[PDB]
Amino acid sequence: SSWWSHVEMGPPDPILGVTEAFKRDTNSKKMNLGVGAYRDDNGKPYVLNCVRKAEAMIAAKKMDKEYLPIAGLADFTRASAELALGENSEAFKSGRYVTVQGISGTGSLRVGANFLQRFFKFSRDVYLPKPSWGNHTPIFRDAGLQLQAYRYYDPKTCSLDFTGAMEDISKIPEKSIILLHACAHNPTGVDPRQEQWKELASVVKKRNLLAYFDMAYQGFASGDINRDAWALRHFIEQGIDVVLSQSYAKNMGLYGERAGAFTVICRDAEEAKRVESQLKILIRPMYSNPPMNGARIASLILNTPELRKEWLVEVKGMADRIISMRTQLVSNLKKEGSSHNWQHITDQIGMFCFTGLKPEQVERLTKEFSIYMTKDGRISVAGVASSNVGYLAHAIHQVTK
Amino acid sequence: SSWWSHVEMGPPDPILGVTEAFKRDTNSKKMNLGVGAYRDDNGKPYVLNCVRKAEAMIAAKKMDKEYLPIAGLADFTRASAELALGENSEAFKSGRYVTVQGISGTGSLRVGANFLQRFFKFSRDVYLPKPSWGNHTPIFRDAGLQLQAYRYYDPKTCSLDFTGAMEDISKIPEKSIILLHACAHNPTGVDPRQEQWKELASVVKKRNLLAYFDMAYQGFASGDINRDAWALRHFIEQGIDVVLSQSYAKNMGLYGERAGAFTVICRDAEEAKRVESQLKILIRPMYSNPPMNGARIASLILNTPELRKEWLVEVKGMADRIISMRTQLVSNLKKEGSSHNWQHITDQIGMFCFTGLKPEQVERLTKEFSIYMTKDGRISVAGVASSNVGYLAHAIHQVTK
Ligand SMILES: Cc1ncc(COP(=O)(O)O)c(CNOCC(=O)O)c1O
Ligand SMILES: Cc1ncc(COP(=O)(O)O)c(CNOCC(=O)O)c1O
């Protein structure tokens, strides 16, 4: 009897645990469709061109490694607020925002969850779509709030349960918190239609609910960043003061460097100035100040005309390629002799597909073909190259056939 | 009445807030002796030679930016455990350790604080020296444990209150937690003497207290890393299973990149394997995985014969130079006509000096000479160059004279 004799064996990460098991496999044909991670068309991890150049200039500068303020790099902070909101925005123009550099999306999400825990005096409840990205549950629980749900997907029709959503949303108690994904819903690939987004807005506004936007895939739903941010900005200008988490993990392909941000839209420049201070008191006893590299790459890109330009060409190339792969998937499916309807595959947007495979089929896939995906049937199409689309097709067919 | 109208203006960081105010000053002679941060002898932020080369090789490799496991870079993890413990160690030889890459010292400290909160079933109390590094209070409080104190420094004699320490320590309730600094006590510069460390050990062991070591300055107390780790290893081999936080923020001069680690010495390889899993469940809903750059630089240095070698030459050069500056300080003091006793200046070890200046003197210093330090009278000698030792001396004298 030791200090830790009572500490039991906790299970591997639902998602993250998929790269683990993937690593270990000896099949030369294994494919990791586990986490939303882009592979170029050789299915080689891809580092954007503009990032490679952003690193070169920093390099060249012979920059110091001195501690960054508790809120992060001013320049990255400010440039993110902008990417989120648009430069014309009254919110942005007026300075009624506070943006803190955070530990990528996951970290922004959590500083955010702990901020609310601490200053959101109106409710302990955070309402999450059904289904949501797995980590939302624990981020929120470890922070100290309660979890609730609003109906989102409908597996019968492979899309948005707009009447059911509208119903749960309409009954959320005034002033609770609700998590909405900005675009490329994870895990479903289904997003409200402009029109729907206008309606959600109304009911959100009407119930005076605190809107919390998870924006990890901006430029991944349509190949266009301003378009992707539509719903977000439509809210704020409808008079909704949101909170949001942003990640550069996928759109900049900055994954392991970890760069993200957390923002609060307040009412004044003075309120923003007051929240900033508190965000900083909260963040100090956490990790004191954040990782400088990712913030530095991104800020040079966002703030360098040519670097941003290149950035959109290449954020465009990624969205497209995911599209050719969806296309081609469906195609081989039919070509392999698939009897099923694979329309959702090319219907869905973002990095994933929500295929509908049942667990024994997901399991056989892993075991017989070395194709690694989460057991909810979600596969990352992000991860498919011209070279293995055939292989996935076949596999999919065998196990389904 | 907004969401955040009730959120008040919290004060600037006690330490961190000193770089802020420093930044803003227009005096060409301002000096920032606020945070423990090394400046070369031009008093220019210094990036070690071996780091500059570590970056070059990574660069050259054209490494990917893919997500790292929840526990960090295996290689950095393992190499830190070693730097902490020594390669001969039974602890290390046997694998009864779990090391998680964390968000520098501050972050390791907190993962650690939350781990305890969650699995340390024996007490909610963490006993901190008097005085301790400021952030210890809030790290620990935000995590959820209670704070307590053991007498440490004695301002009458400018040293260790060994009878008072021994007394408080001897009365700590069995199984509580106690934070001990490994070397270069922050803020005092006073460390137990080998002999004292042997005695602390006994009373710790005897009371069956959970020893928590904060090791942020290894190679800063003596210019020698193995020596610096003496007390730490002496504990474990006396049968004490500790927990420790390590930082590479000062010894690698990796400040803003943020690389650190948190370790638990358990009883077996299987227990270690069980704690690892739980550490990872805890860390996932936090920041999902940590900043890859610092971990990558450090691991190439620690694990490259030539890179480590260079590393010690240069960790030796930093300790030395801090010594010449202390020396010279005292010297000018006398030369400026100082009536006081400045023996503690050269008596103390590490990055700081605990000068004894009262707040009105600290204040005048800031205001008349542009010398920025914390109000506890602590100055970072780390920060003095051959060029400004004269200036500090004078200043010190004026305000003291
Ligand atoms: C919707 C959503 N929000 C937020 C995030 C967080 O991403 P990051 O922390 O990498 O910025 C992700 C990241 N996902 O990919 C990795 C995983 O499941 O852990 C995500 O899908
Ligand atoms: C004793 C001690 N432990 C732990 C730490 C944490 O250092 P880091 O998080 O930079 O690794 C420090 C860092 N101090 O310098 C910066 C500050 O006061 O915030 C320290 O002195």
GROMACS .gro file of C-alpha atoms in nm, chain B residues 21-370:
model
  350
  422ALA     CA    1   0.543   4.863  -1.650
  423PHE     CA    2   0.906   4.808  -1.745
  424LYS     CA    3   0.810   4.793  -2.110
  425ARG     CA    4   0.639   5.132  -2.103
  426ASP     CA    5   0.925   5.333  -1.950
  427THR     CA    6   1.109   5.585  -2.168
  428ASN     CA    7   1.435   5.603  -1.966
  429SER     CA    8   1.725   5.472  -2.177
  430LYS     CA    9   1.877   5.340  -1.859
  431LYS     CA   10   1.576   5.136  -1.740
  432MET     CA   11   1.674   4.782  -1.619
  433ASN     CA   12   1.424   4.499  -1.569
  434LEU     CA   13   1.531   4.304  -1.263
  435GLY     CA   14   1.175   4.179  -1.228
  436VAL     CA   15   1.155   3.810  -1.337
  437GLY     CA   16   1.440   3.557  -1.315
  438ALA     CA   17   1.563   3.606  -1.673
  439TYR     CA   18   1.923   3.586  -1.789
  440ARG     CA   19   2.082   3.855  -2.001
  441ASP     CA   20   2.427   3.806  -2.149
  442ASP     CA   21   2.698   4.066  -2.052
  443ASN     CA   22   2.558   4.336  -2.279
  444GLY     CA   23   2.242   4.257  -2.096
  445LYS     CA   24   2.088   4.124  -2.415
  446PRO     CA   25   1.844   3.831  -2.393
  447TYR     CA   26   2.053   3.527  -2.449
  448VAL     CA   27   1.966   3.225  -2.657
  449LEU     CA   28   2.217   2.940  -2.590
  450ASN     CA   29   2.450   2.828  -2.860
  451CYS     CA   30   2.342   2.468  -2.829
  452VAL     CA   31   1.974   2.581  -2.868
  453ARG     CA   32   2.057   2.776  -3.184
  454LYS     CA   33   2.213   2.456  -3.322
  455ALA     CA   34   1.926   2.232  -3.195
  456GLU     CA   35   1.689   2.450  -3.397
  457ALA     CA   36   1.903   2.418  -3.715
  458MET     CA   37   1.884   2.037  -3.722
  459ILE     CA   38   1.503   2.030  -3.680
  460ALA     CA   39   1.490   2.288  -3.952
  461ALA     CA   40   1.711   2.081  -4.173
  462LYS     CA   41   1.503   1.769  -4.105
  463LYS     CA   42   1.198   1.952  -4.243
  464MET     CA   43   0.996   1.804  -3.957
  465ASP     CA   44   0.626   1.756  -3.953
  466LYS     CA   45   0.391   1.940  -3.716
  467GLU     CA   46   0.164   1.653  -3.629
  468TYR     CA   47  -0.002   1.616  -3.298
  469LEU     CA   48   0.214   1.469  -3.015
  470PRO     CA   49   0.075   1.212  -2.771
  471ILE     CA   50  -0.112   1.339  -2.471
  472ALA     CA   51   0.201   1.279  -2.261
  473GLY     CA   52   0.441   1.465  -2.496
  474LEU     CA   53   0.754   1.360  -2.684
  475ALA     CA   54   0.868   1.017  -2.548
  476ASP     CA   55   1.221   1.121  -2.604
  477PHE     CA   56   1.199   1.450  -2.418
  478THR     CA   57   1.000   1.280  -2.136
  479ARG     CA   58   1.254   1.005  -2.078
  480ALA     CA   59   1.555   1.239  -2.115
  481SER     CA   60   1.408   1.467  -1.835
  482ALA     CA   61   1.339   1.182  -1.595
  483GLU     CA   62   1.704   1.107  -1.643
  484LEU     CA   63   1.830   1.466  -1.585
  485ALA     CA   64   1.617   1.469  -1.272
  486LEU     CA   65   1.719   1.126  -1.131
  487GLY     CA   66   2.065   1.025  -1.273
  488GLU     CA   67   2.110   0.721  -1.503
  489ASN     CA   68   2.224   0.480  -1.233
  490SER     CA   69   1.916   0.536  -1.011
  491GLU     CA   70   1.706   0.231  -0.913
  492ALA     CA   71   1.390   0.443  -0.965
  493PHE     CA   72   1.495   0.513  -1.323
  494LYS     CA   73   1.654   0.162  -1.388
  495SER     CA   74   1.330  -0.008  -1.272
  496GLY     CA   75   1.082   0.222  -1.450
  497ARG     CA   76   0.884   0.320  -1.137
  498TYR     CA   77   0.847   0.677  -1.272
  499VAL     CA   78   0.586   0.852  -1.499
  500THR     CA   79   0.697   1.174  -1.665
  501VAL     CA   80   0.453   1.385  -1.860
  502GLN     CA   81   0.574   1.672  -2.078
  503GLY     CA   82   0.393   1.980  -1.928
  504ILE     CA   83   0.355   2.354  -1.995
  505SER     CA   84   0.690   2.445  -1.859
  506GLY     CA   85   0.741   2.451  -1.485
  507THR     CA   86   0.425   2.647  -1.423
  508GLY     CA   87   0.221   2.390  -1.622
  509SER     CA   88   0.390   2.084  -1.468
  510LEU     CA   89   0.320   2.235  -1.126
  511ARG     CA   90  -0.048   2.269  -1.211
  512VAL     CA   91  -0.102   1.926  -1.376
  513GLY     CA   92   0.058   1.808  -1.059
  514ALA     CA   93  -0.166   2.022  -0.841
  515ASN     CA   94  -0.478   1.887  -1.020
  516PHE     CA   95  -0.350   1.529  -1.010
  517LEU     CA   96  -0.317   1.551  -0.632
  518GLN     CA   97  -0.658   1.724  -0.599
  519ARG     CA   98  -0.800   1.429  -0.781
  520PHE     CA   99  -0.598   1.126  -0.652
  521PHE     CA  100  -0.428   1.237  -0.319
  522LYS     CA  101  -0.699   1.097  -0.085
  523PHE     CA  102  -0.506   1.169   0.234
  524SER     CA  103  -0.514   1.554   0.277
  525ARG     CA  104  -0.614   1.881   0.104
  526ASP     CA  105  -0.309   2.061   0.256
  527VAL     CA  106   0.006   2.189   0.080
  528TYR     CA  107   0.268   2.346   0.300
  529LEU     CA  108   0.484   2.614   0.139
  530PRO     CA  109   0.805   2.775   0.268
  531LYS     CA  110   0.796   3.128   0.408
  532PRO     CA  111   0.858   3.296   0.174
  533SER     CA  112   0.786   3.107  -0.154
  534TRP     CA  113   0.761   3.198  -0.525
  535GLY     CA  114   0.432   3.391  -0.556
  536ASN     CA  115   0.251   3.173  -0.811
  537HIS     CA  116   0.269   2.868  -0.579
  538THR     CA  117  -0.029   3.013  -0.382
  539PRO     CA  118  -0.273   3.049  -0.675
  540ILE     CA  119  -0.158   2.737  -0.868
  541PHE     CA  120  -0.245   2.535  -0.564
  542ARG     CA  121  -0.566   2.724  -0.473
  543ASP     CA  122  -0.710   2.723  -0.826
  544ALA     CA  123  -0.639   2.343  -0.831
  545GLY     CA  124  -0.843   2.304  -0.508
  546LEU     CA  125  -0.612   2.228  -0.212
  547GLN     CA  126  -0.564   2.434   0.105
  548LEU     CA  127  -0.246   2.632   0.179
  549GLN     CA  128  -0.021   2.610   0.485
  550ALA     CA  129   0.324   2.730   0.584
  551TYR     CA  130   0.652   2.620   0.732
  552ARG     CA  131   0.903   2.890   0.851
  553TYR     CA  132   1.195   2.913   0.604
  554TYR     CA  133   1.389   3.240   0.590
  555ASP     CA  134   1.507   3.454   0.872
  556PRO     CA  135   1.557   3.814   0.775
  557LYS     CA  136   1.742   3.889   1.098
  558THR     CA  137   2.036   3.679   0.991
  559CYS     CA  138   1.960   3.659   0.613
  560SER     CA  139   1.936   3.284   0.603
  561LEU     CA  140   1.764   2.948   0.664
  562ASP     CA  141   1.567   2.937   1.000
  563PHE     CA  142   1.677   2.577   1.044
  564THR     CA  143   1.532   2.534   1.403
  565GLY     CA  144   1.200   2.694   1.304
  566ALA     CA  145   1.180   2.490   0.984
  567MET     CA  146   1.259   2.172   1.168
  568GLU     CA  147   0.989   2.261   1.418
  569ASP     CA  148   0.702   2.329   1.173
  570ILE     CA  149   0.809   2.038   0.962
  571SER     CA  150   0.809   1.806   1.268
  572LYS     CA  151   0.451   1.903   1.345
  573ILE     CA  152   0.302   1.866   0.989
  574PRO     CA  153   0.023   1.609   1.013
  575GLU     CA  154   0.120   1.271   0.865
  576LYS     CA  155   0.047   1.233   0.493
  577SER     CA  156  -0.003   1.608   0.414
  578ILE     CA  157   0.187   1.748   0.107
  579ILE     CA  158   0.493   1.977   0.139
  580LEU     CA  159   0.657   2.188  -0.135
  581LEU     CA  160   1.031   2.205  -0.118
  582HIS     CA  161   1.241   2.383  -0.374
  583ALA     CA  162   1.517   2.156  -0.523
  584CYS     CA  163   1.786   2.438  -0.536
  585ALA     CA  164   1.826   2.822  -0.576
  586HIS     CA  165   1.536   2.896  -0.347
  587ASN     CA  166   1.307   3.153  -0.502
  588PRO     CA  167   1.294   3.418  -0.363
  589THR     CA  168   1.566   3.400  -0.102
  590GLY     CA  169   1.867   3.240  -0.268
  591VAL     CA  170   1.907   3.024   0.050
  592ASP     CA  171   1.915   2.648   0.031
  593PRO     CA  172   1.951   2.384   0.308
  594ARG     CA  173   2.311   2.260   0.349
  595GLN     CA  174   2.363   1.885   0.251
  596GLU     CA  175   2.347   1.795   0.617
  597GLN     CA  176   2.023   1.985   0.661
  598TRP     CA  177   1.884   1.820   0.355
  599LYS     CA  178   1.973   1.486   0.524
  600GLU     CA  179   1.768   1.587   0.828
  601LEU     CA  180   1.468   1.724   0.639
  602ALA     CA  181   1.459   1.387   0.468
  603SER     CA  182   1.431   1.201   0.799
  604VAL     CA  183   1.159   1.420   0.936
  605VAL     CA  184   0.975   1.396   0.592
  606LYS     CA  185   1.009   1.021   0.586
  607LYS     CA  186   0.924   0.993   0.952
  608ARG     CA  187   0.598   1.196   0.915
  609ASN     CA  188   0.515   1.019   0.591
  610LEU     CA  189   0.456   1.347   0.411
  611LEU     CA  190   0.423   1.357   0.028
  612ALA     CA  191   0.727   1.545  -0.095
  613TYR     CA  192   0.667   1.784  -0.388
  614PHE     CA  193   0.985   1.923  -0.543
  615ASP     CA  194   0.980   2.233  -0.763
  616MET     CA  195   1.295   2.200  -0.977
  617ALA     CA  196   1.311   2.503  -1.204
  618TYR     CA  197   1.679   2.598  -1.149
  619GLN     CA  198   1.887   2.281  -1.200
  620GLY     CA  199   2.243   2.385  -1.283
  621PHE     CA  200   2.182   2.735  -1.136
  622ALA     CA  201   2.273   2.680  -0.770
  623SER     CA  202   2.626   2.547  -0.835
  624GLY     CA  203   2.699   2.548  -1.208
  625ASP     CA  204   2.664   2.169  -1.189
  626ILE     CA  205   2.344   1.980  -1.263
  627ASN     CA  206   2.411   1.652  -1.082
  628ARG     CA  207   2.508   1.848  -0.774
  629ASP     CA  208   2.196   2.060  -0.801
  630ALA     CA  209   1.981   1.741  -0.809
  631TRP     CA  210   2.158   1.605  -0.490
  632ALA     CA  211   1.873   1.673  -0.243
  633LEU     CA  212   1.613   1.538  -0.486
  634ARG     CA  213   1.786   1.202  -0.541
  635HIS     CA  214   1.895   1.177  -0.177
  636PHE     CA  215   1.516   1.171  -0.092
  637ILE     CA  216   1.407   0.898  -0.327
  638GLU     CA  217   1.697   0.669  -0.235
  639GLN     CA  218   1.605   0.726   0.135
  640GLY     CA  219   1.276   0.563   0.031
  641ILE     CA  220   1.079   0.878  -0.033
  642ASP     CA  221   0.854   0.866  -0.336
  643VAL     CA  222   0.827   1.226  -0.457
  644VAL     CA  223   0.654   1.426  -0.721
  645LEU     CA  224   0.839   1.697  -0.906
  646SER     CA  225   0.797   1.979  -1.162
  647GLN     CA  226   1.088   2.068  -1.390
  648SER     CA  227   1.142   2.370  -1.608
  649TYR     CA  228   1.378   2.428  -1.895
  650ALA     CA  229   1.268   2.790  -1.899
  651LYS     CA  230   1.600   2.917  -1.740
  652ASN     CA  231   1.864   2.646  -1.773
  653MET     CA  232   1.798   2.605  -2.150
  654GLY     CA  233   1.690   2.971  -2.182
  655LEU     CA  234   1.377   2.830  -2.351
  656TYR     CA  235   1.139   3.075  -2.166
  657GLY     CA  236   0.859   3.152  -2.406
  658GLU     CA  237   0.864   2.816  -2.597
  659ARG     CA  238   0.755   2.654  -2.280
  660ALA     CA  239   0.904   2.308  -2.211
  661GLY     CA  240   0.878   2.132  -1.870
  662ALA     CA  241   0.773   1.804  -1.720
  663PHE     CA  242   0.587   1.649  -1.429
  664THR     CA  243   0.693   1.323  -1.265
  665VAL     CA  244   0.556   1.086  -1.007
  666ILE     CA  245   0.785   0.818  -0.839
  667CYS     CA  246   0.558   0.525  -0.776
  668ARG     CA  247   0.641   0.174  -0.646
  669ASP     CA  248   0.635  -0.042  -0.962
  670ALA     CA  249   0.637  -0.029  -1.340
  671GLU     CA  250   0.269  -0.135  -1.330
  672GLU     CA  251   0.164   0.149  -1.091
  673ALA     CA  252   0.359   0.398  -1.308
  674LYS     CA  253   0.173   0.247  -1.602
  675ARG     CA  254  -0.163   0.314  -1.417
  676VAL     CA  255  -0.092   0.678  -1.313
  677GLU     CA  256   0.023   0.753  -1.672
  678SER     CA  257  -0.322   0.665  -1.799
  679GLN     CA  258  -0.492   0.890  -1.540
  680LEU     CA  259  -0.248   1.180  -1.598
  681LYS     CA  260  -0.352   1.152  -1.964
  682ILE     CA  261  -0.728   1.148  -1.892
  683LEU     CA  262  -0.662   1.469  -1.683
  684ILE     CA  263  -0.445   1.639  -1.945
  685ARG     CA  264  -0.677   1.566  -2.242
  686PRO     CA  265  -0.962   1.806  -2.138
  687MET     CA  266  -0.699   2.070  -2.051
  688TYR     CA  267  -0.500   2.149  -2.372
  689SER     CA  268  -0.527   1.804  -2.541
  690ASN     CA  269  -0.147   1.773  -2.616
  691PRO     CA  270   0.149   2.015  -2.550
  692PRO     CA  271   0.375   2.251  -2.735
  693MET     CA  272   0.618   2.057  -2.951
  694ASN     CA  273   0.894   2.311  -3.017
  695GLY     CA  274   1.064   2.342  -2.671
  696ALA     CA  275   1.039   1.963  -2.617
  697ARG     CA  276   1.204   1.902  -2.956
  698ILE     CA  277   1.491   2.152  -2.896
  699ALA     CA  278   1.562   2.010  -2.545
  700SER     CA  279   1.531   1.645  -2.641
  701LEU     CA  280   1.789   1.691  -2.928
  702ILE     CA  281   2.023   1.865  -2.673
  703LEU     CA  282   1.974   1.612  -2.386
  704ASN     CA  283   2.005   1.319  -2.628
  705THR     CA  284   2.299   1.443  -2.846
  706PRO     CA  285   2.634   1.380  -2.679
  707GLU     CA  286   2.791   1.700  -2.824
  708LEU     CA  287   2.477   1.899  -2.770
  709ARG     CA  288   2.459   1.798  -2.404
  710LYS     CA  289   2.833   1.869  -2.357
  711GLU     CA  290   2.807   2.218  -2.501
  712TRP     CA  291   2.495   2.258  -2.287
  713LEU     CA  292   2.691   2.207  -1.961
  714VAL     CA  293   2.975   2.435  -2.061
  715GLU     CA  294   2.720   2.709  -2.123
  716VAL     CA  295   2.508   2.633  -1.805
  717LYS     CA  296   2.837   2.676  -1.631
  718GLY     CA  297   2.909   3.004  -1.800
  719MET     CA  298   2.566   3.148  -1.676
  720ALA     CA  299   2.615   3.046  -1.310
  721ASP     CA  300   2.966   3.196  -1.310
  722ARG     CA  301   2.870   3.527  -1.468
  723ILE     CA  302   2.588   3.560  -1.211
  724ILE     CA  303   2.865   3.517  -0.956
  725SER     CA  304   3.099   3.783  -1.102
  726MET     CA  305   2.799   4.025  -1.098
  727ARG     CA  306   2.716   3.959  -0.730
  728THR     CA  307   3.080   4.010  -0.646
  729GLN     CA  308   3.112   4.330  -0.834
  730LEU     CA  309   2.782   4.454  -0.695
  731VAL     CA  310   2.898   4.441  -0.333
  732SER     CA  311   3.225   4.594  -0.439
  733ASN     CA  312   3.075   4.903  -0.600
  734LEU     CA  313   2.841   4.930  -0.305
  735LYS     CA  314   3.143   4.979  -0.081
  736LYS     CA  315   3.309   5.192  -0.350
  737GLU     CA  316   2.995   5.412  -0.372
  738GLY     CA  317   3.039   5.451   0.003
  739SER     CA  318   2.787   5.201   0.135
  740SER     CA  319   2.766   5.181   0.509
  741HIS     CA  320   2.552   4.874   0.502
  742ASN     CA  321   2.648   4.510   0.506
  743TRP     CA  322   2.586   4.362   0.153
  744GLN     CA  323   2.726   4.015   0.237
  745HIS     CA  324   2.398   3.841   0.159
  746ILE     CA  325   2.432   3.957  -0.204
  747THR     CA  326   2.729   3.722  -0.258
  748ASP     CA  327   2.613   3.481   0.006
  749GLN     CA  328   2.284   3.396  -0.183
  750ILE     CA  329   2.275   3.156  -0.483
  751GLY     CA  330   2.074   3.126  -0.806
  752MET     CA  331   1.931   3.413  -1.013
  753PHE     CA  332   1.820   3.643  -0.733
  754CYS     CA  333   1.929   3.835  -0.432
  755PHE     CA  334   1.688   3.904  -0.149
  756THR     CA  335   1.828   4.254  -0.070
  757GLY     CA  336   1.600   4.359   0.212
  758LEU     CA  337   1.502   4.697   0.054
  759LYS     CA  338   1.175   4.827   0.198
  760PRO     CA  339   0.900   4.930  -0.048
  761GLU     CA  340   0.955   5.308  -0.054
  762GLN     CA  341   1.313   5.240  -0.158
  763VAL     CA  342   1.201   4.988  -0.425
  764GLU     CA  343   0.958   5.257  -0.540
  765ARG     CA  344   1.209   5.540  -0.556
  766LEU     CA  345   1.440   5.307  -0.747
  767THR     CA  346   1.172   5.258  -1.022
  768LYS     CA  347   1.067   5.615  -1.026
  769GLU     CA  348   1.418   5.784  -1.007
  770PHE     CA  349   1.647   5.539  -1.176
  771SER     CA  350   1.413   5.319  -1.387
   0.00000   0.00000   0.00000
